[model samples]
Target: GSSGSSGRIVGELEQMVSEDVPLDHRVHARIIGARGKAIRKIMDEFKVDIRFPQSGAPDPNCVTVTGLPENVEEAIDHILNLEEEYLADSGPSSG
Candidate 1:
């Protein structure tokens, strides 16, 4: 499948930022519900990919987001906000 639209621009404001946000000891299943809801309001909706490790995975505790400069930043912020909410609702203490 080929299309018009030349190719990648020589110079563009593309950005990539990855962070291991604190899960606050909360499980992925308990947090994805809030995460999904926040993503809907993003401007570059489809341009971002936010991934959370499935429950019971060998390793966990990170919500990876990748996309264009603005989109990626926005997605990460929204995800962090959700994490804070989950932590607050879950109360303090790591069990």
Candidate 2:
């Protein structure tokens, strides 16, 4: 008997999504690192993508995070923590 060939795509794909997190422009330099060194660690750890707008952007505080919902949330949390830590470390000293 002859047989016919059939192909189908199976398995569920991850629901990729994007989220906007508000980050102070002042902390952007620290969060982004000298050459994205710190950014890589955060993205690699959570398997997510993080974006910052150009200097000319109207809302410089807006940062975009893209990836699976779970990953996005984790990345956002990490980013927020980093921002807080950096700000605290360099709190404007009034000597």
Candidate 3:
């Protein structure tokens, strides 16, 4: 007789490229959106954690996402897509 292993495969990746984003605070603020509506939406929709590091924390620009591998990837992909849309809607000329 043999026992079966049970677990899901999920991966983690980080992206930190330079963007034309104007204000420093705006990057984090934009991700969170008004009253955290956008962030909440992302978390609810993707079922993952997208958190900004606390004040005086290292890697302030970093947004840490934690969850099952697949869920984490899905969440990150969704967030990146949203960022692209936000920049496009806001106007490419601004960036």
**TM-score for each prediction?**
0.51, 0.76, 0.59
Q: In order, how many clashes per candidate?
A: 0, 0, 2
The best-first sequence of candidates by TM-score reads 2, 3, 1
Report the C-alpha lDDT of model 3 over 33-54, residue by residue, as the tens digit: 8798878887767566666767
Among all candidates shown, the one with the greatest lDDT: 2
Model 3 misplaced stretches (Cα beyond 4 Å): 1-26, 88-95
In model 1, which range of ten residues has the least summed lDDT?
A: 9-18
Model 2: per-residue Cα lDDT over 19-47, one tens digit each: 99999887998888998988888887877
State each model's CA lDDT, in order: 0.55, 0.80, 0.60
Per-residue C-alpha lDDT of model 1 across residues 7-94, encoded as one tens digit per residue: 5432233555444444543745555557565444442453565666566744477655655664566566666676677666765568
Clashing pairs in 1: none
Compared with the true structure, the alpha-carbon lDDT of candidate 3 equals: 0.60
Whole-model alpha-carbon lDDT for candidate 2: 0.80
